[PDB]
Amino acid sequence: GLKAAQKTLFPLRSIDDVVRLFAAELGREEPDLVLLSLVLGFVEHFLAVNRVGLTYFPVADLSIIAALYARFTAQIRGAVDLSLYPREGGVSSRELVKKVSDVIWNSLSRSYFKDRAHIQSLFSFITGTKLDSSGVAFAVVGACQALGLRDVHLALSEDHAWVVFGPNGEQTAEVTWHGKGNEDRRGQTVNAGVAERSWLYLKGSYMRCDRKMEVAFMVCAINPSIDLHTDSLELLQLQQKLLWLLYDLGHLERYPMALGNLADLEELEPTPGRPDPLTLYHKGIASAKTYYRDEHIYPYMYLAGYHCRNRNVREALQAWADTATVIQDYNYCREDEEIYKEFFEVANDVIPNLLKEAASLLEAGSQGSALQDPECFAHLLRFYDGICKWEEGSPTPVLHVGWATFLVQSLGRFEGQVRQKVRIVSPVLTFQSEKMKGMKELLVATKINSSAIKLQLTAQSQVQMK
């Protein structure tokens, strides 16, 4: 509107007043995305971007928020003439969605760093004419709600955002960019990406948000970071409370990554009487299994990261083996580079550092070490198996000799007598990839044959002539 009933909690003088606003909005038929995003971006601005003058909480006065809201609705209503796009069926057309996407896109500053913090909200859009990639998608959905287009909803993968709309909410449209130096496909469907079985489009098992999930998205999108070394405790507390509000109302049921975010917040500062972080990570994974065919990677990455921080080697390896078991049934496509980067960092940095510490601790007499547990060696092997299987049939390869050195080093952290105890069947482990099936021979020698490993992992045809 803003409607009279939306205004009665103002001014917001505290974290808990913001929470009350969210609770009130979530109790309405259609929570007001524009109002909520402006409020979050306002408080984020004054708690993370510019804390000059801060004494407790940046009071959000109705006059200030209403004026921001008016700037948004005036910009959208002036630019989008709904009479030019007649709505058949109480649903929107592709042309109308593209128009809204154009209006947001064309409003943005000509030149800015797209990867900077605090450019996610409508507050950034109105005051700085800056949005990040998924911020543009959110803004298009907020603009469509403001226009009365109840069918337009946010669609989310693990690295991208677009909208669904139209009859039965069955249409898809690109509304923002993806990555850096990819050609924009705004206006198009996502069918080619679903059909090529890329991770970016999750084989079609992406999130199709309702309004409540779009609220959850903006809450996950809060960025408490003040700088590299410093987070806003106020914004961490706000995000954590809003996530629990959403959780209690049922709106994180179909949002795996939000559960992982909340688990991470609880690890940092536990809320008395709430589920442990581990419980929450496992609920994230359950969500992915239940609603998204177990086709998501981050629920397992979140779990693994928690075990890695707690130096739980065994359970970190199991979770990373599970991440690889998901990825194996995708094709590695152009525009999947963020998930390649994650797997690369885990294989080539995180696991080696973890195993190096484990090796030192073993030398010092640790008992029950992952390095003496053949089931842990099997998890490491299943992690590599899934990466190798991922690469099979992909249009772009994954592995290269830069991975092989770390594989040899990681295998060698397990003594031969531990490695011997895994039974590789055609602990028991079965390999899905042809690369690992050929490597089986090499995996039990007391001294691993480094060169042969390297040849098998990279499928390098020849050794040096001279």
Ligand X SMILES: N#Cc1cc2cc(CN3CCC(Nc4ncnc5sc(CC(F)(F)F)cc45)CC3)ccc2n1CC(N)=O
Query: Contact positions toward ligand X, by CB under 6 A?
Result: 134, 156-161, 220, 257-258, 298, 301-302, 304-305, 308, 342, 345-346, 350
CA distances from 393 to 161, 205, 338, 383, 450 (A): 26, 20, 19, 18, 26
Q: Which residue(s) pair with 329 in the sheet?
A: none
Whose CA is closest to 339, among 295, 287, 404? 295
CB nearer ligand X, residue 193 or residue 305: 305
Across 269-307, b (16+ Cβ under 10 Å) vs e yields eeeeeebebbebbbbbbebbeebbebbbbbbbbbbbbbb
CB nearer ligand X, residue 178 or residue 389: 178
CB of 271 to ligand X, least distance (A): 20
CB of 318 to ligand X, least distance (A): 12
- Pairing state between β 428-429 and 423-424: parallel
CB of 192 to ligand X, least distance (A): 18
Cross-sheet strand order for the sheet of 161-165: 171-173, 161-165, 153-156, 207-208
Whose CA is closest to 254, among 216, 223, 220? 216
CB of 263 to ligand X, least distance (A): 11
- CA dihedral (38, 40, 46, 50) positive or negative: negative
Q: How far apart are CA 187 and CA 165, in angstroms?
A: 12
CB of 7 to ligand X, least distance (A): 30
Contacts of 2-8 spanning 24+ positions with Cβ under 8 A: 2/32, 2/35, 2/66, 2/69, 6/32, 6/35, 7/62, 7/66
CB nearer ligand X, residue 242 or residue 258: 258
Check: CB of residue 80 under 8 Å from CB of residue 99.
Answer: yes
Whose CA is closest to 240, among 220, 254, 212, 225? 220
CB of 446 to ligand X, least distance (A): 31
CB nearer ligand X, residue 85 or residue 199: 199
CB nearer ligand X, residue 6 or residue 157: 157
Q: How deeply is 101 buried, as exposed, middle or buried, from its count of CB atoms within 10 A (0-12, 13-18, 19+)?
A: buried
CB of 48 to ligand X, least distance (A): 17
CB nearer ligand X, residue 131 or residue 147: 131
CB nearer ligand X, residue 163 or residue 439: 163
CB nearer ligand X, residue 140 or residue 308: 308
CB nearer ligand X, residue 302 or residue 377: 302
CB of 86 to ligand X, least distance (A): 31
Q: How far apart are CA 76 and CA 80, in angstroms?
A: 6
Q: Give the count of beta carbons closer than 10 Å to the beta carbon of residue 149.
A: 23
CB nearer ligand X, residue 387 or residue 418: 387
CB of 176 to ligand X, least distance (A): 8
Q: How far apart are CA 280 and CA 212, in angstroms?
A: 19
Q: What residue type is 161 in one-letter code?
A: A
CB of 295 to ligand X, least distance (A): 15
In the 3-class helix/strand/coil scheme, how is 210-233 assigned residue by residue?
A: CHHHHHHHHHHCCCCEEECCEECH
CB of 73 to ligand X, least distance (A): 24
C-alpha gyration radius of the chain? 25
Query: What are the tokens at 172?
Result: 């898809």
Q: How far apart are CA 13 and CA 350, in angstroms?
A: 43
CB nearer ligand X, residue 96 or residue 339: 339
